[PDB]
Design a protein around this ligand. Structure first.
Ligand SMILES: [Mg+2]
Length: 179
RNA sequence: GGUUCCAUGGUGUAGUGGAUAACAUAUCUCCCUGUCACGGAGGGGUUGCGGGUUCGAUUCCCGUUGGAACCGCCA
């Protein structure tokens, strides 16, 4: 990606100067964006889960692996050995492609993207974005599951400090309130 | 003293071999009638206590209460 090379040059220079980092790779580096569109309807409407996967596939270019619960609950109708939820973890070129596509196409189409930040870092440098609806994503046709759901896009970084993660986010211009 | 059975709606009783609780009376609302009873329509209301097993107990297991049914002899 041309923006990937732009990321290289720009992130290196500003970050290096911003904290006098003694090495170019001391600057934070983003690793992997997990997407987890999971639903318990597979306990009853198994069909739905299948469609779920395809949409997830259609969004990232990686086929989603379906995850299984590690316990069993009667109230939730849960039982061990069943597949409830798919997770995809993008890396390399595809992860940066999805990140740019999200921030530039999907996110500003959000009904009311006022944003949320500073109050999202887990204290170790991660970040989770809770999407409310799937239809807003461009890689989705109107025909879909009878139920509509959101997403749990998350982020990782090489650093362990949440403040430096915020600094990388600002350098990348991820558009949130004051952050 | 010991042994078998039972505890389900307000009252009388069925079910459940773990995933679910009905019948009648009674109760409420509305037709009905001068009025009321009877009648007609509709509505509503449930596992003795505890503690384990199971993802899940009214049901399966062991204890604790209450009510019954049987026995407690030979000198
Ligand atoms: Mg005698």
């Amino acid at each position: 990606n041309n923006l990937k090379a732009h990321y290289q040059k720009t992130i290196a220079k500003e970050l290096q100067k911003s904290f006098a980092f003694s090495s170019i790779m001391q600057v934070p580096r983003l690793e992997k964006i997990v997407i987890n569109m999971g639903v318990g309807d597979a306990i009853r409407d198994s069909k739905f889960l299948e469609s779920a996967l395809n949409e997830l596939h259609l969004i990232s270019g990686q086929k989603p692996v379906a995850t299984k619960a590690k316990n069993a609950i009667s109230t939730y109708k849960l039982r061990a050995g069943q597949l409830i939820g798919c997770k995809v973890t993008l890396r390399g070129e595809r992860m940066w492609a999805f990140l740019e596509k999200l921030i530039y196409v999907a996110l500003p189409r959000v009904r009311d993207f006022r944003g949320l930040s500073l109050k999202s870092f887990d204290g170790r440098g991660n970040y989770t974005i809770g999407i409310k609806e799937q239809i807003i994503f461009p890689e989705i046709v109107y025909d879909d599951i009878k139920r509509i759901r959101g997403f749990d896009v998350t982020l990782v970084t090489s650093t362990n400090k949440d403040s430096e993660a915020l600094a990388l986010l600002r350098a990348l211009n991820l558009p949130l309130v004051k952050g």
